[PDB]
Symmetry: C7
């Protein structure tokens, strides 16, 4: 692999997903969460040179945030909130970029992971009603 796989965090629940393109980096990512469940529920990704929107999980959240990533822009700082355990859930995401851009999504009330950094390339995990589990993917 020409990739780094960050630890998938959260539960074993929902349907597996893996978004990646052969010579392709993420150009846009969207987080949808609720104040009712304090969870992530829905994620969309767009890729470079590809108009196609790749979605997973049920967009039942009252908030969304999108981060748009320039062609030369990397993730230097990355934090996923989650609930640990087999019945676990991904609850939150902060990201910060080589250009001072940041996004903050959902809640960080239990467990965290400060992931690897670099050019964000894909995401992997499991999602149904909620984002059960999420790991980021980078280049080397």
């Amino acid at each position: 692999d020409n990739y780094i796989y960050s630890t998938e965090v959260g539960g074993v629940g929902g349907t597996p997903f893996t978004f990646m393109q052969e010579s392709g980096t993420i150009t846009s990512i969207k987080f949808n969460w609720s104040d009712q469940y304090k969870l992530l529920h829905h994620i969309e990704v767009k890729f470079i040179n590809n108009a196609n929107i790749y979605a997973t999980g049920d967009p039942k959240g009252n908030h969304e945030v999108i981060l748009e990533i320039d062609d030369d822009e990397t993730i230097i700082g990355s934090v996923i909130g989650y609930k640990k355990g087999n019945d676990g859930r991904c609850t939150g995401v902060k990201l910060t970029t080589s250009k001072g851009k940041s996004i903050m999504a959902g809640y960080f009330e239990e467990s965290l992971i400060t992931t690897y950094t670099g050019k964000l390339a894909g995401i992997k995990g499991g999602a149904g009603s909620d984002i059960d589990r999420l790991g980021l993917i980078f280049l080397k």
Copy 2:
């Protein structure tokens, strides 16, 4: 295209508008918003070498701000506040320039996007009584 199209955020309502000029960059942009609705209602854009004011939406807000951009000034930080959904609306905007100029219009109470950065070339979206949706447009 030599253009970067940021995600149009907000609703599908209102009349579509596209402001862009062959070989031209925005030299002035105005945002008009109300405390009453917590929405953007009206945008004006001037372009380099062109005394024409392209306007959209009903200018019924009690506040407006204008950002004038020098020929060599770029947007380095960009956040649009909006209400997601078909029945959506663009609620606020926050720009910061390569010269430390910044403006802030409206409210950021629901969803946000941190857009692409670069030399702002124009805008597109939909507007009637309100700015239903707004996407920014940069040079490569």
Copy 3:
């Protein structure tokens, strides 16, 4: 010359003063408005004035021969019946002034070497535009 947007109303008497070595703003707490502006140019002892100096406050910014505006905010009320309400300026040498009120509308202007001002004034400063060198 770069001409920044004149912001405020259509009222009062047109003025055009045209490097600025000195600019003074006069405003009041009663009306929360700019009433009067005075300007001196380099190599000229003449004081150019507009608007009625009725206000209880004034500030002066003196500008060194090599000192530019890098930060510029004019506060105003919008519309035909508009007024200029305030001015913040910040220079390339870290100097800054703060005049009047910023309670409704703002413009962040073009930056550079301040060369003049245009607008209209009577009792008040109805409308103000900064002018810079290219």
Copy 4:
């Protein structure tokens, strides 16, 4: 030796561990702590080019944090909070790194050590129910 052994702090209790790979550095670290006991309880570590999770302690706390360390990333700031004496215990860890990443696990109510700095290579200590005692280990 090609290594630096930071002082093991805390008590004499629990079962000995020593996790270190010759010619290998710690790529991931997880701290599991409780709000009930105000203690670290469990630690997992993964080395580079090795999916095997080397774990010690009982994972019975309500919180966990995970730091993923990039191949060229070093620890520039390191604080373990502990209770001193024979019946002593490890109670917290704050790690700050050469890229600005930071994790804060546990509580710092009694005693602190600001360790040696560099490339985190391994951990040594004793653990049962609780992390009784922890010492970081770096390269030279």
Copy 5:
């Protein structure tokens, strides 16, 4: 003329003073003010290579500040608070230097000038009971 004369601010009152020495700079300047009147009352100046004190005004204030200037240190920040009009007065002075030294004397409740900057050469104005009027003078 090798000199910049900053605008004299304040009133027409008091006895004229003008303190300056050809090829001489201010090595020290003292401001005396009162909480009673909220006015500057007295000013003193020493010049480089000269023990003599050039004074103006009635030293009746409950406070004074002295700023000593090294031979190569200039003024980069200078603000005089004053009451405008013919019956006007000087109320305050903030000065900051090229070495990060600063003094603050009296009050700033009505009018300010942010003056010219550079090597402080002398002072000019009128003073009796109070400082009616003050303009600074710098080298080119």
Copy 6:
């Protein structure tokens, strides 16, 4: 000498101590203090290339902090709290290193010394139940 002796501060009481090793710098130092007396009570030092722990004063405090010092790490900031007088006492110690590490032991309610700075080489003073007196020793 090739050493810098910081002022010993505190009282004349206790048993004199000197902890220095020819060709060796302190690689570790531990402060033990109490909330009961608001004094430093006990101090331990380890030296580069030496596993021997040098100790003085009675370890009766409820808090201890340890600072580990990389071989190339100096002290850039040093404050000792103490009571003045013959019957005086050393009450706390704050050290900041050339790598941004810092510690804070005991109390600063009475007198303080901002010491000399450099590579910390030893310590000296007197101790019994308390640290009566502490002086730091640096290389030139």
Copy 7:
């Protein structure tokens, strides 16, 4: 002279003192003050290559602070608080060095001088019960 005499501030009272040594710089200075009188009472100075303490004033204060000055360390910021007048007194001293060291002694309620800066070489003034009057001395 190869010396800069900062203004002596405070009163005419007390016994004159002058601390200076020919090719010498202040290596240690102590300031004794009281919360009772809000005055400096006592001052001690040690010089480079000289174990002798030069003292002035009456040590009646409940507070003291000591600054040690490395041989290549200068004063870059200096403030003396004082009561002006014939019956004036020196009330306080703030010093900041070329290495980020700083000390605060006594009180700043009335008058201040921001002195000349450079390598502190002595002090001059008068003292009895109190420090009546204090002026610093630098090298050129």
